[PDB]
Amino acid sequence: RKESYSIYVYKVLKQVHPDTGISSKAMGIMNSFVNDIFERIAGEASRLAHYNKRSTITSREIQTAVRLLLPGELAKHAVSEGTKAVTKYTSA
DNA sequence: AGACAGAAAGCTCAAGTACTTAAGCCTGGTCTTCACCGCAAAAACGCACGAACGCGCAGACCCCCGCGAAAAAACCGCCAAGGGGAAAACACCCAAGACACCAGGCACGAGACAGAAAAAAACAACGAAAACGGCCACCACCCAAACACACCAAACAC
Fold this sequence. Notes:
Structural class: mainly alpha
Main location: nucleus
GO cellular component, one term: nucleus
Number of strands: 0
Number of helices: 4
Subcellular location: Nucleus; Chromosome
Distance between the termini: 33 Å
Shape: globular
Strand content: under 5%
Keywords: nucleus, nucleosome, transcription-DNA-RNA complex
Helix content: over 70%
PDB class: transcription/dna/rna
């Protein structure tokens, strides 16, 4: 039962485009994409942590990594989204 | 009132103490110039876990061989337009000069802010029980794959 991001990418698609489906080949592309972005961000956060002699990866490390990797408006909106989500989550 | 005496500062004259020098030149050799202090991190050896090792079974799936339809791939030929060569020329860039700027070097001052130290707690990891989200199995539906018709419209000729 080798695990994947499929259910979520289909949930998000159904939210943004209720009448649009997804081929298996394109679904594979999305899984690869998610995995790749995950590894870019986590790796940058790891480097940041090591440089500053810290042992925990917190939201600050992730935010900075996002700012370093995502170009322009992609970064600005991603940061907004991430901040909104961690705000909503802490205040439950 | 004055005359006598005693008590004074003074003054001088013997003991004790601090300080100084100690011939000129010359030749070799040997020895030594922070010592004792102790943390860093590279390393020794035991102990216990557990990750990877072995080996055995399952079967999935990769290799090989077969025949046919179909198409792309190979070969040949005309030829046109494109790559390349030669030529003009003009004004774009390099070169040389004189005058001047500001980069560079050194200096000192002030202090913002980086690195360290000591405290203190909120936050992450651990063990545990728990149940529901995400996976597999398998069904049915309809998007796009396909074939057949057709109108449309770019191409090139004149």
